[PDB]
C-alpha cells in the first residue's frame, strides 16, 4: 500500500501578500516540488511524470497553474466576506491524494486545515466541515458549494485522475520504490549508551541492545530522522550503571542485509 500526497501550504500575511508552496510525496519519496517562485511544477524524480504523455502532463500542469492563482484570490475574497470575524495572518494547508490498495482498489481524500486545524474536506460531491469546526465556516462552505464546475472537477480529480496517475507512478518508479539501502551503525555514550544507525532504506528496522543471547528491556528507540539522500537515521539508547558497559552489543536487523545482522560490541 502506498499513499500519494499533494501537500499545499499557503500563507496570507495581509490583504496583498501571499505565497503558495507545494510538495508531492509517494510514500516517503518526494516526486514533485512547486515553489511560489516557479511558474511550473518541478519533477524531483526521473519518473515523476508517471505514465502520462507530454500532452496530458502539459495540460494538467496548466490547470494547476490557473488553480494556484484562483485559490489565492478565492481565499482573499472569502476573508473579505467574513470580515471582521477572521483576519490576517492566515495559514491554509491542503492535503490531497489517494491510498492505493491491492488490486484495482483505492480511496481518495482532500483535507483542508485553517490556522493548523483540520476543518474541511471534500467528500462525495461537495465540501463539508468536519466535527469540531467553527460554525462561521458554513458561509464559505455554502459559497464553495455553489460552484458546480469546481465540484465536478474535484470529483474527477479524486475519483479518476488521481488513482490513474498513481498507478502509472508505481510502475515507473518501481525501481526506486523498491530500493534497498544498507544501514551503517556506530556506538557512543554520554554521562547512557547510544547505537547510531544511518543510511538505511526502506524504513522498517530493528535495533536492540543485547548482552549475548538476551535482549535488554530498557532499550529506547528514538524517532526516525531523515537524511538528505532519502535514507533514514535512527538511534536506540540504553541507560546502564557505569562499569556494566562490557559485554553489551548493539544488534541491527534490516531487509537490506539479507539476514546478516550488524553486531557491534562495546
Amino acid at each position: 500500500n502506498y499513499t500519494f500526497r499533494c501537500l499545499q501550504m499557503s500563507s496570507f500575511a495581509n490583504r496583498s501578500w501571499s505565497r503558495t508552496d507545494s510538495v508531492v510525496w509517494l510514500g516517503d519519496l518526494q516526486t514533485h516540488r512547486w515553489s511560489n517562485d516557479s511558474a511550473t511544477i518541478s519533477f524531483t524524480k526521473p519518473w515523476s511524470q508517471g505514465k502520462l504523455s507530454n500532452q496530458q502532463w502539459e495540460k494538467l500542469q496548466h490547470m494547476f497553474q490557473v488553480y494556484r492563482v484562483s485559490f489565492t484570490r478565492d481565499i482573499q475574497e472569502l476573508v473579505k466576506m467574513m470580515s471582521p470575524k477572521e483576519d490576517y495572518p492566515i495559514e491554509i494547508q491542503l492535503s490531497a491524494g489517494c491510498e492505493m490498495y491491492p488490486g484495482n482498489a483505492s480511496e481518495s481524500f482532500l483535507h483542508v486545515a485553517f490556522q493548523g486545524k483540520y476543518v474541511v474536506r471534500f467528500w462525495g460531491t461537495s465540501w463539508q466541515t468536519v466535527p469540531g469546526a467553527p460554525s462561521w465556516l458554513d458561509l464559505p462552505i455554502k459559497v464553495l458549494n455553489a460552484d458546480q464546475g469546481t465540484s465536478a472537477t474535484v470529483q474527477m480529480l479524486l475519483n479518476d485522475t488521481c488513482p490513474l496517475f498513481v498507478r502509472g507512478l508505481l510502475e515507473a518508479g518501481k525501481s526506486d520504490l523498491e530500493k534497498q539501502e544498507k544501514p551503517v551503525a556506530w556506538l557512543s555514550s554520554v554521562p547512557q549508551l547510544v547505537c547510531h544507525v544511518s543510511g538505511f532504506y526502506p524504513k522498517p528496522v530493528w535495533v536492540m541492545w543485547m548482552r549475548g543471547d538476551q535482549e535488554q528491556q530498557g532499550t529506547h528507540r528514538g524517532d526516525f530522522l531523515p537524511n538528505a539522500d532519502e535514507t533514514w537515521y535512527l538511534q536506540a539508547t540504553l541507560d546502564v550503571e557505569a562499569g556494566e558497559e562490557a559485554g553489551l552489543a548493539c544488534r541491527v536487523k534490516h531487509s537490506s542485509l539479507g539476514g546478516q545482522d550488524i553486531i557491534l560490541y562495546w
Epitope: S70, K80, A146
Partner: T-cell receptor
C-alpha cells in the same frame, strides 16, 4: 429578483455631494456598483458582501460606499467632478454567479 | 481589456440575419452571458452559456460558446426594428459569487425598417 435605483437621473455641480442609492428586497447578501461610459465595458467601483461591509472594486477613486442594511447600498461622491459624469448600475446577488442589475442612473456633473 | 467584441457596429435591413462575435482571454471562464441594452435603458439578459462547447437559443436569438477557442457568437435571425441596441458580451470567471464579471464594450446594431 428586483433592484431599484434612485435618483434615476441627476444634474449636479462640481464639488457637490451626490448620493446614489440602490435598494433590493431579495435578501441578497451581495451588492455591486458599476459605471458604464462610452467605449468601455461596465467597470466595478465598490461592492459589498453584507451589512457594514464595503470593499474596493477596480476603480474606487473619488467614491465612497455605504452598506447600512441588507437592503440598501449607497454610492457617495463627496466632491463630484466632471469626470464622474456617467451611467451607474447597481446589482445584487446571492452565493450563485448571477448578478441582478438595476435600471441605471444618469449622472451629469457640470462645472 | 480581456473581452473583445466585433464588429464595433453594423447596420442591417429588417428581415436580415446577423452574427456578433465575442473573443476573450479571461481565465478561468466559467460562463458567458449576452445582454441587450436599448439606448437609454438597462441590461436585459438574452442567454448564458456554461459548457465547454455550448449552444443556446431564445426566440430569434441563438448563441454558441467554444471555451477552447475562447469565442462566442450571437446570431439574430430575421432582425426587427426592436433589435436596434447595443449587445454586450460578459464573461464570469467563477461559478459562484467569488467571481468577477468581465464586460465587453458592446456592439452597436442598427436595423433599417
Amino acid at each position: 429578483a428586483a433592484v431599484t435605483q434612485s435618483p434615476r437621473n441627476k444634474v449636479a455641480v462640481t464639488g457637490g455631494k451626490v448620493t446614489l442609492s440602490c435598494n433590493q428586497t431579495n435578501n441578497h447578501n451581495n451588492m455591486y456598483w458599476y459605471r458604464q461610459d462610452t467605449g468601455h465595458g461596465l467597470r466595478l467601483i465598490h461592492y459589498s458582501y453584507g451589512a457594514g461591509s464595503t470593499e474596493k472594486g477596480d476603480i474606487p477613486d473619488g467614491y465612497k460606499a455605504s452598506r447600512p442594511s441588507q437592503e440598501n447600498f449607497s454610492l457617495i461622491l463627496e466632491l463630484a467632478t466632471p469626470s464622474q459624469t456617467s451611467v451607474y448600475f447597481c446589482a445584487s446577488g446571492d452565493e450563485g454567479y448571477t448578478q441582478y442589475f438595476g435600471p441605471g442612473t444618469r449622472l451629469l456633473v457640470l462645472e | 481589456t480581456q473581452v473583445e467584441q466585433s464588429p464595433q457596429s453594423l447596420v442591417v435591413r429588417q428581415g436580415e440575419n446577423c452574427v456578433l462575435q465575442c473573443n476573450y482571454s479571461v481565465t478561468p471562464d466559467n460562463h458567458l452571458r449576452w445582454f441587450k441594452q436599448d439606448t437609454g435603458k438597462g441590461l436585459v439578459s438574452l442567454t448564458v452559456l456554461v459548457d465547454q462547447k455550448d449552444k443556446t437559443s431564445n426566440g430569434r436569438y441563438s448563441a454558441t460558446l467554444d471555451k477552447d477557442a475562447k469565442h462566442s457568437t450571437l446570431h439574430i435571425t430575421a432582425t426587427l426594428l426592436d433589435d436596434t441596441a447595443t449587445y454586450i458580451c460578459v464573461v464570469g470567471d467563477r461559478g459562484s459569487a467569488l467571481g468577477r464579471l468581465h464586460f465587453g464594450a458592446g456592439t452597436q446594431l442598427i436595423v433599417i425598417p
